[PDB]
From a paper:
We sought to employ a fragment-based approach toward targeting the interaction between the C-terminal “tail” of [name] myosin A (PfmyoA) and binding partner myoA tail domain interacting protein (PfMTIP). This PPI is thought to be central to the malaria parasite’s ability to glide and invade host cells in a defined, directional manner, as correct localization of the myoA motor protein depends on its interaction with [name] (called myosin light chain 1, MLC1, in other apicomplexan parasites such as Toxoplasma gondii). We have taken a different approach by studying isotopically labeled PfMTIPΔ60 (containing both [name] domains) in solution using multidimensional NMR techniques, and recently reported assignments of the 1H,15N-HSQC spectra of both the “free” and “bound” states, along with a detailed analysis of the conformational dynamics and thermodynamics of the system. It was found that the free protein is highly flexible on a range of timescales from millisecond to sub-nanosecond exchange processes, which may explain the difficulty in crystallizing the protein in isolation.
The CSPs of 8 localized to the [name] CTD including several contiguous [name]–myoA hotspots, for example, Leu 168, Trp 171, Gly 172, Asp 173, Ala 174, and Thr 176 that form the loop connecting helices α6 and α7, involved in the key intramolecular clamp with Ser 108. Taken together, these results suggest that the primary amine linked to the furan via a thioether represent key features of 8. However, given that one end of the molecule was not necessary for interaction with [name], it was hypothesized that attachment of the key moieties of 8 to a myoA tail peptide would enable an X-ray structure of the bound fragment to be obtained. Because the N-terminal part of PfmyoA(799–818) binds to the same site as the fragment, we systematically truncated the myoA tail at this end to create a library of chimeric molecules.
Author numbering:
A (entry chain A): 61 to 68, 71 to 204
B (entry chain B): 802 to 816
Amino acid sequence: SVADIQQLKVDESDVRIYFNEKSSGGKISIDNASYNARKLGLAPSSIDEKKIKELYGDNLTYEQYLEYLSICVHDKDNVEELIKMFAHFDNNCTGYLTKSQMKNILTTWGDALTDQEAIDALNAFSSEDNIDYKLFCEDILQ
Amino acid sequence: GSLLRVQAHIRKKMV
Ligand SMILES: NCCSCc1ccc(C=O)o1
């Protein structure tokens, strides 16, 4: 209600239908809410999930889920912040990180991916060992 | 920080 529901960029019919696909007893789990956010093209982190859990627990009513989705819009996101994070690790200044170097970063810190998730994501992007991380960040943001 | 945004967009893409 106080949330930015109007602004939520997403087809509202999909928002509802995705909720009905995953809801049980009128509520949707956080895991399924984040899944739906992703299907709608939003990118929640653990910070977003923690915020909504702190407010409402593990199972959200429809209204609460709408509020969760509005938390997930991340208008501030840009490619520069993503590139700069990887550039931290590019100490020899090549413009590339290997798949192993990328796998290590993505699986060791933050909202760590599993080895298989990282590997699958990197393999989906490129068949070569050297990854242009600028192009990778451009790809994931869209 | 940034890292989380990177991981978030990868999870989005792989869905
Ligand atoms: N599970 C991550 C919660 S906050 C820790 C963290 C790691 C990296 C960042 C931001 O890039 O934030």
